[PDB]
C-alpha cells in the first residue's frame, strides 16, 4: 500500500525556494486530485485563496473539507514529493507551523485555512508563478476559539475594543489574526442558520435554571458568576416570574440536547486529526485521520 504523490513542477526551482520549502517538511498539504502524479496547480489552498483582498473562509473550509489531505516529506528541484492521508492509516505530522502554537499530548488538531495573514504561511514560487499557501494546524480548543472570534467579528463589525477581540490570546505569546469585512454568501447563510437555531433555542428554553442563576447571584459570588457584576439580567428576571414544573422542562431538555448537537455540528466543519505521543523536542506527532 503505497501513498506517494510525486508532484512534478512545471519549471525548475530556485535555491531560496528550496530553503523555504525544506523548513516546512512534515506539514499538511491539501490536494485537489488524489492521483499518483499531479501538477502544482490545484495544490495548496491557492486556487481558492488567490491574490485577492477579500478572503472567503467558509469557501476555504468547503475546499479543505472534500479535498484529500497530505503530508509533505521531501523536496528537490522540479519535484516536491508528498504522501497522502487516507482514513485508516497513521502518519507523523510535524509541527513546523509558523504561528508556533504548541500542541498538547495526544489531543486533537483540526486543520484550518490561514487566518493569521497570508504571507505568514505562503511559500512564494516566482519561478513557477504559483503561491503554495498552507493550511494551519492547531489544537481544537484554540480552533473553536478562532472560529468563534471570526464569527463574533463578522457580526460585530457589521452591527457597529473590537481590535482586542481580533487578538487571539495564546499563553506564551498572543497573536493577531487577519480579519475580513464580508464573508461571502455562505457565511451570511450560516449566520441565518445560527440566528434561526438560536431563536428556536430561546423558544424552547427552560425556566428553573433561570431560577437557579437569579437565586444564586444574590446568594453566592462565584468564579462563574462574577461576569454579572452583582446584576440579574432584565429578561431573566422578567421571565422568572412564573411557577415551575418538571415534565415540561423534561420535554424542553429533550429538544435542547438534540439541537445543541446540531449546533455543535455547525462549528465542527474542517477535518479532525487524532494525535498521540506528541513531543516538544522532536516536534513530531503520531497522528491518523479521525
Amino acid at each position: 500500500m503505497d501513498l506517494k504523490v510525486v508532484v512534478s513542477l512545471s519549471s525548475r526551482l530556485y535555491t531560496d525556494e528550496i530553503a523555504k520549502m525544506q523548513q516546512r517538511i512534515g506539514c499538511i498539504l491539501p490536494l485537489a486530485s488524489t492521483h499518483g502524479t499531479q501538477n502544482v496547480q490545484g495544490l495548496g489552498l491557492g486556487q481558492v485563496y488567490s491574490l485577492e483582498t477579500v478572503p472567503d473562509y467558509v469557501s476555504m473550509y468547503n475546499y479543505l473539507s472534500d479535498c484529500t489531505l497530505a503530508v509533505l516529506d521531501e523536496v528537490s528541484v522540479d519535484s516536491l514529493i508528498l504522501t497522502k492521508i487516507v482514513p485508516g492509516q497513521t502518519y507523523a505530522i510535524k509541527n513546523k507551523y509558523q504561528p508556533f502554537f504548541q500542541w498538547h499530548g495526544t489531543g486533537s488538531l483540526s486543520v484550518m485555512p490561514p487566518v493569521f495573514g497570508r504571507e505568514h504561511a505562503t511559500v512564494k514560487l516566482e519561478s513557477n508563478d504559483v503561491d503554495i499557501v498552507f493550511p494551519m494546524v492547531l489544537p481544537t480548543p484554540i480552533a473553536e476559539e478562532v472560529l468563534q472570534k471570526i464569527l463574533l467579528f463578522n457580526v460585530y463589525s457589521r452591527v457597529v475594543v473590537h481590535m482586542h477581540l481580533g487578538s487571539v490570546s495564546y499563553l506564551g505569546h498572543h497573536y493577531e489574526l487577519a480579519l475580513p469585512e464580508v464573508p461571502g454568501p455562505l457565511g451570511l447563510a450560516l449566520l441565518d442558520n445560527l440566528s434561526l437555531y438560536f431563536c428556536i433555542m430561546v423558544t424552547l428554553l427552560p425556566r428553573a435554571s433561570m431560577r437557579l442563576v437569579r437565586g444564586l447571584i444574590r446568594h453566592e459570588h462565584h468564579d462563574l458568576l462574577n461576569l454579572f457584576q452583582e446584576m440579574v439580567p432584565d429578561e431573566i428576571a422578567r421571565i422568572d416570574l412564573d411557577d415551575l414544573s418538571v415534565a415540561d422542562d423534561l420535554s424542553r431538555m429533550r429538544v435542547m440536547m438534540t439541537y445543541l448537537q446540531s449546533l455543535a455540528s455547525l462549528f465542527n466543519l474542517g477535518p479532525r486529526l487524532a494525535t498521540a505521543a506528541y513531543s516538544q523536542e522532536t516536534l513530531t506527532a503520531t497522528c491518523w485521520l479521525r
Partner: peptide
C-alpha cells in the same frame, strides 16, 4: 519477545 505494535506508512 519482539512484537510490532504500529504499522504506519513511515515506520
Amino acid at each position: 519477545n519482539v512484537s510490532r505494535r504500529e504499522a504506519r506508512v513511515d515506520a
